[PDB]
Structure formats: structure tokens, C-alpha cells
């Protein structure tokens, strides 16, 4: 029996374009889809289907096996809502991530919706029509699948849940976050127990290297000020600028005394001794910055935004906020090439957004689209895909982090 | 026969109920003849008063043309054709290549029974008091929205088997043209063809006879296609005395087309003729440099150069040169300096930039192009040194990445004509700018700028500063704008101001630029 699903009222199906893939990826995609065809998971479609979703081939961590990744971003957006997050999970010591996508492959998709799951394996230099298909079963990556498989899912989990209540389990799209605080040795073993307990029902790889996220250790990178021996006119000016900026967040920041040191068109390199007044003013500014601005609460009904700044030498800076300057979180990331790092970053950041709020953020990437579109699939490993847009990182925002 | 593709009208719409224009009895007579035959053939079938739908028909020896615009407006969208043509370099050499004309293919394919009713038209009767014959299609209507897609699709299914049965062959569909390439012996190749025509025929699919088939070379959408090589249809440059904006615009067009195969084509000088132009018919006299370019190009064109096909076996090598400020020339080849394709890149991304950035962008275009044509990225050979690249790289806010590339010492070598000092300069005077500046050493200059804009005054100040300052300068400004611009170390710009500054910068020994609120 198939649960009748519908697109939000009025909304038609997606007709997204397919970005040019590399022969190798096309091959992977063909090998895969042909087997999924044999297994009745998908079926070829005709020209009467004008819709299309982009597919991609990514690489599994610790496997020679490729993974088909469908960008149902647009579809999920035109897909009706369905009618929660364990705030405790973010507190666990170890969160391991499992890919339970194959779960869905054993559940038919409402015949009428199938047409919307249309996708295409492009062909090189347009020498052939391209291979068109649509799903018959629940498709991995579609927001719908988790929902519909929700029931059949809770069943499967209720035993372990009661058997190991010291363990928190969260499902998101094709991912399942298993958390605890047990000794690493134990954590890993109990995990494996779940794997086999999942097999007991039916077709689960370790996402993220089968390694553990340690959310407990996640911490907010506060703003920091240059602590130096001697202070030159330039140092001060930079200092003041930075403070001035930070002021809009922490309005308790005073510069009056530091600016006084800067009276008179002096020489950048001239060393300026600080008056005790300013000395104390700085000290206060420093303490004020020691922690995030109070009053920043997460709104479940607002989009989670995530901007990244390139700092150079394998170093990057990010911030998760819903309202400008009202950062719910900020962090750093160190190494690879710009792109690899960058993707690795986005994925780290996303995973957290999920773990913490259960929602993927919407990134603002410091890169040229054509570029990203070209290499991202080369390092991407998650099963989901965040919403993203490309931008131009302002010179100063970078200097302030 | 082939499996029917189910069609439907657009949601919430109804079949075409359009009235049939009046028809000349001479045209009525011609239609009936045509329709009878079609019916005798099964393509259409007389229907009854049941069907209230109708689509206009008119006469154009006599021919039949039905206006499907309205039906098409009411017909669902299809995944369509492809509007993605292969580029000759993407192809591989072949010993023989024959092309058959799938004569009236659409009429050879059935039509979703449930849809047939919407194709209903009417041949008016000659005399007043009498009724006019009503029909509907059983096959793909010529001019109908579906037809193309549905026809191709079915074609492919029909070809699918034979395709896997005959691996030693390849086929390309394009409208009603079927190209068959092979590396078989003419005889074998020529028979396999016949082996194919039968398979088609097995589905009543007819194709021209060898006696009337088309063999290479092929003049396809701006191309000339030989089994072993390709090029662009020959290009003849005029020799006018009087050149019109229009003539020039076109020339520039044709010239670009060449670009992909003919290296060194240059259109700068000509393109310059279009400045200020008030009419498409306006005549513009050629410059001394425009005449030079035209003539240079004329010569490059006099040489028949050709492209080579893709040899999946060999790697792809891409080579890029700076042809002019902003201009970059490249050629992708597999075998030593024997191109599959070549090309240019003038794309200036942003009001200001530097060769490093601009060269890096050229790389991304080529990379995309390659993937689209050969499914793979080529190994690049660039006139830049890793150290140079790496330096600009790590120091630029935007993330970037260049595939696999080898430095090729082929002048000119892209470089960084200057680098801002990371730390302020001791011993170097200090300027505080805003239209004027003041230095730690007492000096000051104010200037009245006319017409300028807020931002353009900020760069002027700075310019002013650089000018008057000695070899080593420290500059403080509040304009975040100018700071970004200069921090970005551009070496070329559409704005002259910016260029003057850039000049200053190059000449300096050390320059430190700082910002303050
Ligand atoms: C049918 C396979 C495509 C193919 C062609 S057909 C080519 C298809 C586009 C329309 C024009 C003709 C081809 C033609 C020539 Cl003339 C030489 C090499 C070639 N190598 C190939 O792989």
C-alpha cells in the first residue's frame, strides 16, 4: 500500500537542469541505476515526463563503491509538509552517524508522485539522449521518505531503544545519529550491535569514516583582540577599528581612551604607550568579548544561515545565525586545496546544525559557482545537500575573525 | 509497432475548438485527395459529430498543413529534443559514416489513442447544404508539440537493441537524420548499413537508398565534417570600401566562429569601430589598425586548418597564452601541438582584475568546456609559476582551485607587478587621505574634483598620495571600497583612475595600505 503524497497546493514538479558530469561519474551512475532497474527500484521513463532532478556520483568513505546522490532540493521544497529534535543529543559525548538510506528501497512510492522523481544520467558531448528514470520506491534524499518510513522505522527501533535507553537516536533524511557517553571502546561496539540489529530487519555503513562526532567538545570561538608587548599607532588603529565593529554586538565596548592615543597625524610605526585609562578600557573590552552576546535565542521558524570566510593557510571561519550579528554559533576549521577544505567545512557545519537544531543551515560560499559546481562532488560525502549561494567576502569581516 | 506514449492536455484545459477558415473549392478538392490517402494509410480516421474539437487546415503540386498552435498551447510539456549539440572535437575518427533520412518519421509512429480526438480537423464540403468530412490522427502529427520528442524517444527504443547487437558501430540521431559511423571496411560498413535499414523497415521505417544517401563531408550547423577531421564551413571576408556597423558586427560574428579552430584571430580593432555608432546602416571608416587586423585575419583564414577528433586513448592537453591585456588564447590537443579545438577568452569578471585571477578564470571555462565535450578535464600547461600562483592563491579571500597544471615558460609570463606590505613601513612617510591628504611630516594637498562620484574621490585622494610620496609609502584611508580594490591587487581596470594608481603601485618599493573608520 502506498501513502498518497502531494506537492504543496498549486506547485508543479521540478524541472531542474543537470550539471555536466565527468565520464567516470556517468559510468558509476549507469552501473548503479541499471542494477536498481533490475531490482525494480527505478524504471525508465518516456518523454511525457517533463520534470527533472540532478543526480551525482559521490564516493563512500572506506569503499571503492560510488554512491548515487540525487539533489532533490527543489522537489523537497515543492513537497507537502507532513502531519522531533532531542536537545539532549548535542550533549552526548559521542555521536556516530549511520546511513540508513537503503531502508527506503523496500517501500513503494505513490504511483502518482513518481513522475516527480524524474532524473537524468546525462551523456557526453550530447551524443546520446541521456538516460531518464523515475522512482517506484521511496527515494533516498527526498524529504518524504523519512516521514513515510517513520512508522516502519520506530517499530524497528523500539526494542533497542528500550534495551539501550542510555543511547540517543536521531534520524535525519538518510542519516541516523547515535549518541552516548560510554567509553569509546564501548560506544563503537554497541554501535555495531545496532548495525546487525538493523540488518535483522532489512536493507548500514558508517558515515563520516565510522568515526565519532564529539559534540560535547564543540565550543564557540569568541572575538579576540591582539595581546602584544608594545603597541604602535597602526596596532591601535586596527584595534580600534575591530573594537568599533564588535561594538554593534556588545554595546558595552568603549574606545574613547584608545582613540585619544590616536590624536595627531602620527606615523603608523610610532610606538604609543597606553595610558592607564585606556589600559583599563581595553581590559574591559576584552572581558566583555569573553563570551557570546546574551539574548541570542534560536528561532525554529527562521532559516539557519551559515557564512564562511577564507583565512588562508588551510584556515576558515564560520558563523551560524538567523538574525544579523546574532550568532547562535561561530567556529574555525583547519585542513587539500581550497575547494576540498571548503566542502569538508560545509559538511562539518551542516552536521552540527542538524545535531544541534535538527535543521541544515543555508550557506553563503566565498567561491565562483562554476568552480564549486565542478569540484564539490569530488570531496562531498554526506547524503544530504545544504541550500547554498555564492558571495564576495568583504576584506574587513575576515580581518575581524 | 511501437509502444504508445501517453499524452494529456495541460491541467485544467480542454481540446482545441478552433474554427476552420473558408477554403477555396480548388483547395478543398486537393485536401480530400490528401486526406483520403492518409486514411487509406491509417494515419487519420473519419470521426463523428461526437468530437467537438477542431484544428485549422490549409493548402500550400498541393500540400497539407494543419495549424496546431492552439493544440500545442493546450498540449502538455514534454522532456524535449536536446538543444545540446555535440561539438566536433568531442567525436572520434571513423572509417565510414553514412546518414539516412528517416523519411516522414512522425507519420510512422502511432499516437496515444486517448489523445487522438484532440487532433480532429475538418475538410469543408464543396456545396452549401452539405457536411464536411471530420478526421483525427492515429500517428504523430506534423507540427505538433509532441512529435519531435515522442519520435526521438521511440526511435531510440527501436535502435536500442540493434545498438547492443552491433557494438562495432555508433549512431547519432538528429531530427530525421540518422548517422552511422563505423571503423569497418567500406564493404562491411556499407552492408551493416543495409542490415540497419532492414531493422528500421522491420518497423515500417523507411530510409533513402545508397544511391541517394549522404556520405561525408558534412556541412552541419557551421561545420564541415570529414571522417578523420573537422573544420568550420569556409569563411570569406569581404573587401568593401564602405563598412556598415551592420557589416562590421557580422564580420566580428563570423570571425569569432573561426576562433574555435583558427588560432590568433583578433577582433579588438574591429570591435572598436562600433563605439558611438548611431545606426545599423551607419558607415564607419576602417582605422589603420582595423585594416591591419582585417588583413591579418584574412590571411589566417586563407589557410585551410582543420580539427582532429577525440582519441579517448590519449590524454587531453590544454595550453593557454595571453594574447592581449584581457585576451587569452588556448588550444586543447592530445598529440603534440595538433589541436582537437582551440579558442579565446576575453571574459573580464569584475571592473578590476589581474592576470592571475583572469588566467585562473580561463582555466575554469576550459575545464567546464572539456567536461562537456570529452567527459574529462585536460592537463593544463600555463605561463605562470606555481610559486606565483600559490602566493596570490593563499592571499585571496575567495576560495579557488586549478586542476593539474605544468608551468610552461612561454612568454609572456603572467605575474604580480606588486604586493602590498603586510606590515606598515618604518622610515616611510605616512599619509592620511580623504579630496586630499595630510602627512605625519606636515605636508598636505587638497584638490577640487569636478564631476567625480563619492567613491571616485576616495581613489583620487589615494592617487594623489602615491604621486607625491617617495618610493616607500604608508597610506591610511577610511574608504573600505578603495581598500578592497587595492587589496585585491588589480593590474588592469576599466577605470583610468585605477590604472594610474596601479602604475604608481608598481613603481613603489613598498606600499602599506591601511583602513580606519
Ligand atoms: C554517429 C557517431 C557520431 C560521430 C560522427 S556523426 C556526427 C554527429 C553530429 C551531427 C553530424 C555528424 C562523426 C562524423 C564524422 Cl564525418 C567523422 C567522425 C565522427 N565521429 C563520431 O563519433
UniProtKB/Swiss-Prot annotation, chain A:
High-level lineage: Viruses, Riboviria, Pararnavirae, Artverviricota, Revtraviricetes
Domain of life, per lineage: Viruses
Effect of residue 92 to N: Confers resistance to atevirdine, efavirenz, emivirine and nevirapine
Effect of residue 90 to Q: Confers resistance to efavirenz
Effect ascribed to mutating residue 57 to V: Confers multi-NRTI resistance
Protein name as annotated: p51 RT
Outcome of substituting residue 177 to L: Confers resistance to efavirenz
Residues of the full protein shown: 593 to 1014 of 1435
Outcome, altering residue 203 to F: Confers resistance to ph-AZT and zidovudine
Effect after changing residue 262 to I: Confers resistance to delavirdine, efavirenz and nevirapine
Outcome (variant: residue 140 to M): Confers multi-NRTI resistance
Outcome of mutating residue 124 to M: Confers resistance to delavirdine, efavirenz and nevirapine
Organism (species): Human immunodeficiency virus type 1 group M subtype B (isolate HXB2) (HIV-1)
Effect of residue 89 to I: Confers resistance to nevirapine and efavirenz
Effect of residue 90 to P: Confers resistance to TMC125
Stated consequence of mutating residue 179 to S: Confers resistance to efavirenz and nevirapine
Mutation effect (residue 168 to D): Confers resistance to efavirenz, tivirapine and trovirdine
Effect of residue 72 to L: Confers multi-NRTI resistance
Phenotype when changing residue 95 to I: Confers resistance to HBY 097
Outcome recorded upon mutating residue 69 to V: Confers resistance to abacavir, didanosine, HBY 097 and zalcitabine
Effect of residue 95 to A: Confers resistance to nevirapine
Variant or mutagenesis effect after changing residue 97 to I: Confers resistance to efavirenz, emivirine, nevirapine and trovirdine
Effect of residue 65 to R: Confers resistance to zidovudine
Region (RT 'primer grip') residue spans: 206-214
Annotated phenotype, changing residue 39 to D: Confers resistance to zidovudine
Result of changing residue 179 to T: Confers resistance to efavirenz, HBY 097 and nevirapine
Effect annotated for changing residue 60 to R: Confers resistance to abacavir, adefovir, didenosine, lamivudine, stavudine, tenofir and zidovuline
From Swiss-Prot, chain B:
UniProt domain RNase H type-1: residue ranges: 425-517
Effect of residue 91 to I: Confers resistance to nevirapine and efavirenz
Effect annotated for changing residue 99 to I: Confers resistance to efavirenz, emivirine, nevirapine and trovirdine
Record note on what altering residue 181 to S does: Confers resistance to efavirenz and nevirapine
Effect of residue 206 to Y: Confers resistance to zidovudine
UniProt: Mg(2+) 2 binding residues: 434, 458, 478
Effect of residue 80 to G: Confers resistance to pyrophosphate analog PFA
Outcome following mutation: residue 181 to C: Confers resistance to efavirenz and nevirapine
Effect on the protein upon substituting residue 377 to I: Confers resistance to abacavir, lamivudine and zidovudine
Effect on the protein of changing residue 92 to Q: Confers resistance to efavirenz
Effect in UniProt of substituting residue 179 to C: Confers resistance to nevirapine
Variant or mutagenesis effect after changing residue 216 to H: Confers resistance to efavirenz, emivirine, HBY 097 and quinoxaline
Superkingdom per UniProt: Viruses
Effect of mutating residue 175 to V: Confers resistance to lamivudine
Phenotype for residue 210 to E: Confers resistance to zidovudine
Consequence of substituting residue 61 to S: Confers resistance to didanosine and stavudine
Domain Reverse transcriptase: start-end pairs: 41-225
Places the protein is found: Virion
Miscellaneous comment text of the record: Error-prone enzyme that lacks a proof-reading function. High mutations rate is a direct consequence of this characteristic. RT also displays frequent template switching leading to high recombination rate. Recombination mostly occurs between homologous regions of the two copackaged RNA genomes. If these two RNA molecules derive from different viral strains, reverse transcription will give rise to highly recombinated proviral DNAs.
Subunit-level organization: Heterodimer of p66 RT and p51 RT (RT p66/p51). Heterodimerization of RT is essential for DNA polymerase activity. The overall folding of the subdomains is similar in p66 RT and p51 RT but the spatial arrangements of the subdomains are dramatically different.
Role summary: Multifunctional enzyme that converts the viral RNA genome into dsDNA in the cytoplasm, shortly after virus entry into the cell. This enzyme displays a DNA polymerase activity that can copy either DNA or RNA templates, and a ribonuclease H (RNase H) activity that cleaves the RNA strand of RNA-DNA heteroduplexes in a partially processive 3' to 5' endonucleasic mode. Conversion of viral genomic RNA into dsDNA requires many steps. A tRNA(3)-Lys binds to the primer-binding site (PBS) situated at the 5'-end of the viral RNA.
Name the UniProt record assigns to this protein: Reverse transcriptase/ribonuclease H
Species for this entry: Human immunodeficiency virus type 1 group M subtype B (isolate HXB2) (HIV-1)
Lineage: Viruses, Riboviria, Pararnavirae, Artverviricota, Revtraviricetes
Amino acid at each position: 500500500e502506498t501513502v498518497p503524497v502531494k506537492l504543496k497546493p498549486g506547485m508543479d514538479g521540478p524541472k531542474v537542469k543537470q550539471w555536466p558530469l565527468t565520464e567516470e561519474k556517468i559510468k558509476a551512475l549507469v552501473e548503479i541505476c541499471t542494477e536498481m532497474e533490475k531490482e525494480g527500484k527505478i524504471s525508465k521513463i518516456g518523454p511525457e515526463n517533463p520534470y527533472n532532478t540532478p543526480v551525482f556520483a559521490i564516493k563512500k568513505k572506506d569503499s571503492t563503491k560510488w554512491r548515487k546522490l540525487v539533489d532533490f532540493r527543489e522537489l523537497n521544497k515543492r513537497t507537502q509538509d507532513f502531519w522531533p529534535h532531542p536537545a539532549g543529543l548535542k550533549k552526548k559525548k559521542s555521536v556516530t552517524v549511520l546511513d540508513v538510506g537503503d531502508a527506503y528501497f523496500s517501500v513503494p512510492l505513490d504511483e502518482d508522485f513518481r513522475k516527480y522523481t524524474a532524473f537524468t544520467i546525462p551523456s557526453i558531448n550530447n551524443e546520446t539522449p541521456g538516460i531518464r528514470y523515475q522512482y517506484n520506491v521511496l527515494p533516498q534524499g527526498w524529504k518524504g521518505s523519512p516521514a513515510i518510513f517513520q512508522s516502519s522505522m520506530t517499530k524497528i527501533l523500539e526494542p533497542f531503544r528500550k534495551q539501550n535507553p542510555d543511547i540517543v537516536i536521531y534520524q535525519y533524511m538518510d542519516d541516523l545519529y547515535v549518541g552516548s557517553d560510554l567509553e569509546i571502546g564501548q560506544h563503537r561496539t554497541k554501535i555495531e550491535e545496532l548495525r546487525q540489529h538493523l540488518l535483522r530487519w532489512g536493507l548500514p555503513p558508517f558515515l563520516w569514516m565510522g568515526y565519532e562526532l564529539h559534540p560535547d567538545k564543540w565550543t564557540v570561538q569568541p572575538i579576540v583582540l591582539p595581546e602584544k608587548d608594545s603597541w604602535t599607532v597602526n596596532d591601535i588603529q586596527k584595534l580600534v577599528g575591530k573594537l568599533n565593529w564588535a561594538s554593534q554586538i556588545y554595546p558595552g565596548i568603549k574606545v574613547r581612551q584608545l582613540c585619544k592615543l590616536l590624536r595627531g597625524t602620527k606615523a603608523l610605526t610610532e610606538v604609543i604607550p597606553l595610558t592607564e585609562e585606556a589600559e583599563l578600557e581595553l581590559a574591559e573590552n576584552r572581558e566583555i568579548l569573553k563570551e557570546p552576546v546574551h539574548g541570542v535565542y534560536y528561532d525554529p521558524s527562521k532559516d539557519l544561515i551559515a557564512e564562511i570566510q577564507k583565512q588562508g593557510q588551510g584556515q576558515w571561519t564560520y558563523q551560524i545565525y538567523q538574525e544579523p550579528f546574532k550568532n547562535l554559533k561561530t567556529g574555525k576549521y583547519a585542513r587539500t586545496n581550497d575547494v576540498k577544505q571548503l566542502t569538508e567545512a560545509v559538511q562539518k557545519i551542516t552536521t552540527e546544525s542538524i545535531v544541534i537544531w535538527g535543521k541544515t543551515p543555508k550557506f553563503k560560499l566565498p567561491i565562483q559557482k562554476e568552480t564549486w559546481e565542478t569540484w564539490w562532488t569530488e570531496y562531498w560525502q554526506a547524503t544530504w545537500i545544504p541550500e547554498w549561494e555564492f558571495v564576495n567576502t568583504p576584506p574587513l569581516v575576515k580581518l575581524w575573525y | 509497432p511501437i509502444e504508445t506514449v501517453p499524452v494529456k492536455l495541460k491541467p485544467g484545459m480542454d481540446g482545441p475548438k478552433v474554427k476552420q477558415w473558408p477554403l477555396t473549392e480548388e483547395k478543398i478538392k486537393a485536401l480530400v485527395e490528401i486526406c483520403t490517402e492518409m486514411e487509406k494509410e491509417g494515419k487519420i480516421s473519419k470521426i463523428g459529430p461526437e468530437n467537438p474539437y477542431n484544428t485549422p487546415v490549409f493548402a500550400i503540386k498541393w500540400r497539407k498543413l494543419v495549424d496546431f498552435r492552439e493544440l500545442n498551447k493546450r498540449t502538455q510539456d514534454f522532456w524535449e529534443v536536446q538543444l545540446g549539440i555535440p561539438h566536433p572535437a568531442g567525436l572520434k575518427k571513423k572509417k565510414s559514416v553514412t546518414v539516412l533520412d528517416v523519411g516522414d518519421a512522425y507519420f510512422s509512429v502511432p499516437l496515444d489513442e486517448d489523445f487522438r480526438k484532440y487532433t480532429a480537423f475538418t475538410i469543408p464540403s464543396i456545396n452549401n447544404e452539405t457536411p464536411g468530412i471530420r478526421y483525427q490522427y492515429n500517428v504523430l502529427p506534423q507540427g505538433w508539440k509532441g512529435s519531435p520528442a515522442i519520435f526521438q524517444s521511440s526511435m531510440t527504443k527501436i535502435l536500442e537493441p540493434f545498438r547492443k547487437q552491433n557494438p562495432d558501430i555508433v549512431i547519432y540521431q538528429y531530427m530525421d537524420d540518422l548517422y552511422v559511423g563505423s571503423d569497418l571496411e567500406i564493404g562491411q560498413h556499407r552492408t551493416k548499413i543495409e542490415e540497419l535499414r532492414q531493422h528500421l523497415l522491420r518497423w515500417g521505417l523507411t530510409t533513402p537508398d545508397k544511391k541517394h544517401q549522404k556520405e561525408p563531408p558534412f556541412l552541419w550547423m557551421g561545420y564541415e565534417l570529414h571522417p578523420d577531421k573537422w573544420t568550420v564551413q569556409p569563411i570569406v571576408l569581404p573587401e568593401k570600401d564602405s563598412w556598415t556597423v551592420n557589416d562590421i558586427q557580422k564580420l566580428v560574428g563570423k570571425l569569432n566562429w573561426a576562433s574555435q579552430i583558427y588560432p590568433g584571430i583578433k577582433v579588438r580593432q574591429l570591435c572598436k569601430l562600433l563605439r558611438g555608432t548611431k545606426a545599423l546602416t551607419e558607415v564607419i571608416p576602417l582605422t589603420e589598425e582595423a585594416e591591419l587586423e582585417l588583413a591579418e585575419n584574412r590571411e589566417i583564414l586563407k589557410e585551410p586548418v582543420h580539427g582532429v577528433y577525440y582519441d579517448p586513448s590519449k590524454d587531453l592537453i590544454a595550453e593557454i597564452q595571453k594574447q592581449g591585456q584581457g585576451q587569452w588564447t588556448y588550444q586543447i590537443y592530445q598529440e603534440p601541438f595538433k589541436n582537437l579545438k582551440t579558442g579565446k577568452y576575453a571574459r573580464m569578471r569584475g571592473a578590476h582584475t589581474n592576470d592571475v585571477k583572469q588566467l585562473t578564470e580561463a582555466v575554469q571555462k576550459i575545464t567546464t568546456e572539456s567536461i562537456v565535450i570529452w567527459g574529462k578535464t585536460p592537463k593544463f600547461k600555463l605561463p605562470i609559476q606555481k610559486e606565483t600562483w600559490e602566493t596570490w592563491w593563499t592571499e585571496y579571500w575567495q576560495a579557488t582551485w586549478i586542476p593539474e597544471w605544468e608551468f610552461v615558460n612561454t612568454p609572456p609570463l603572467v605575474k604580480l607587478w606588486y604586493q602590498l606590505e603586510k606590515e606598515p613601513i618604518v622610515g616611510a612617510e605616512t599619509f592620511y587621505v580623504d579630496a586630499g591628504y595630510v602627512t605625519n611630516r606636515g605636508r598636505q594637498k587638497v584638490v577640487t574634483l569636478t564631476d567625480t562620484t563619492n567613491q571616485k574621490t576616495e581613489l583620487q585622494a589615494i592617487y594623489l598620495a602615491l604621486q607625491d610620496s617617495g618610493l616607500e609609502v604608508n597610506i591610511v584611508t577610511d574608504s573600505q571600497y578603495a581598500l578592497g580594490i587595492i587589496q585585491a591587487q588589480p593590474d588592469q581596470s576599466e577605470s583610468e583612475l585605477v590604472n594610474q594608481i596601479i602604475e604608481q603601485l608598481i613603481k613603489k618599493e613598498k606600499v602599506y595600505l591601511a583602513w580606519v573608520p
